[PDB]
């Protein structure tokens, strides 16, 4: 019974899961679009939305708070320099997820998790 | 009977267009699963099904159908291909010569492992 | 655990070598039996040495 457990362990320990979620965010920040599985992308979305939300105000406290999550100054500076300037005043949902088929080794459903404000060719409708 | 006469009479394959895939290192029970989805379908619906099937037994079955289409185009040179409306008349997945290897089980005994093969045959036929 | 065969290419030759078979009177009959049967490999001394 998991009547309310709104968190995906991703078949990993409590430390490995957070390490992977912090390692994927740096990649999604330095390259504005990465290719993952569907569940990992859906978890990365919920992990990275509040960070980009906090990044909309450059304070010495918010910088350290985001650093405590990202654990890399190279991603902290690249999130606070241009990602925050290009997001602007969006209400929410700074990322999009698009399925691109299945893999070959284990037949896993793939996804193309991307930033909304960095893709100028796709709108949705 | 005269064997040359029997062979000249049986050489009626100048009309039927078919394709064969012999000595494929895959089991027949796993390709008979994807053959049932293709049997009887149109020549393009079958291609789409084989291209988007979530089975490793379709990557080499989707090009056997293309080879069959090319053989049909070779045999019926006078005429296009989309007006005929090809389909998959018959498709059979048979067995093949299997290799035998040994796996050491616990307590000093050996079990047998048979790497199986399979033969695939496909004929197209036309609606016209 | 420790098995029964712990190889040694001198304890092998001191016990099954050609000069150990040829030294005894009844050990010299093993050579005759093997030559009569037609064994391509005689006593373990037939194994090639390291070169």
């Amino acid at each position: 019974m998991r009547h309310g457990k709104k968190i995906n362990h991703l078949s990993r320990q409590t430390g490995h899961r957070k390490a992977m979620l912090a390692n994927m965010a740096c990649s999604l920040i330095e390259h504005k679009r990465i290719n993952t599985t569907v569940a990992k992308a859906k978890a990365l979305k919920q992990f990275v939305e509040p960070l980009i939300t906090k990044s909309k105000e450059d304070t010495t406290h918010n910088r350290r708070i985001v650093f405590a999550y990202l654990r890399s100054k190279y991603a902290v500076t690249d999130l606070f320099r241009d990602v925050a300037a290009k997001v602007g005043d969006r209400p929410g949902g700074y990322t999009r997820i698009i399925k691109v088929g299945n893999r070959l080794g284990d037949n896993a459903d793939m996804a193309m998790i991307e930033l909304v404000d960095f893709n100028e060719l796709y709108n949705g409708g | 009977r005269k064997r040359e006469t029997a062979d000249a009479r049986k050489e009626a394959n100048k009309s039927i267009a078919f394709a064969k895939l012999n000595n494929c290192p895959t089991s027949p029970r796993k390709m008979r699963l994807v053959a049932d989805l293709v049997r009887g379908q149109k020549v393009e619906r079958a291609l789409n099904i084989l291209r988007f099937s979530s089975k490793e037994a379709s990557r080499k079955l989707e090009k056997l159908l293309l080879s069959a289409i090319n053989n049909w185009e070779q045999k019926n040179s006078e005429g296009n291909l989309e007006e005929a409306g090809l389909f998959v008349k018959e498709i059979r997945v048979d067995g093949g010569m299997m290799l035998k290897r040994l796996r050491p089980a616990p307590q000093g005994r050996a079990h047998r492992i048979r790497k199986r093969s399979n033969h695939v045959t496909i004929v197209l036929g036309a609606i016209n | 655990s420790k098995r029964t065969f712990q190889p040694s290419k001198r304890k092998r030759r001191n016990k099954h070598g050609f000069m150990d078979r040829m030294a005894s009177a009844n050990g010299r009959k093993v050579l005759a039996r093997r030559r009569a049967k037609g064994r391509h490999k005689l006593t373990v001394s037939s194994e090639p040495r390291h070169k």
Partner: protein, 59 residues
């Protein structure tokens, strides 16, 4: 436990009736005509079309 009787080719054939495969949900886009999986993107020619638009232009 161990089977007491060899499974007949009828009892083992009536059991392999739900062992069939499942044909995927294939759709077609009325932009480039290429077929794809429903609710999935696809690469046509150096590009990625999803819903009539272009997501990636790698040409």
């Amino acid at each position: 436990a161990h089977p007491k009787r060899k499974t007949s080719k009828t009892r083992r054939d009536k059991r392999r009736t739900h062992y069939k495969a499942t044909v995927a949900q294939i759709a077609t886009c009325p932009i480039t005509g290429e077929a794809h999986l429903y609710h999935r993107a696809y690469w046509h020619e150096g590009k990625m079309y999803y819903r009539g638009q272009v997501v990636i232009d790698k040409s």
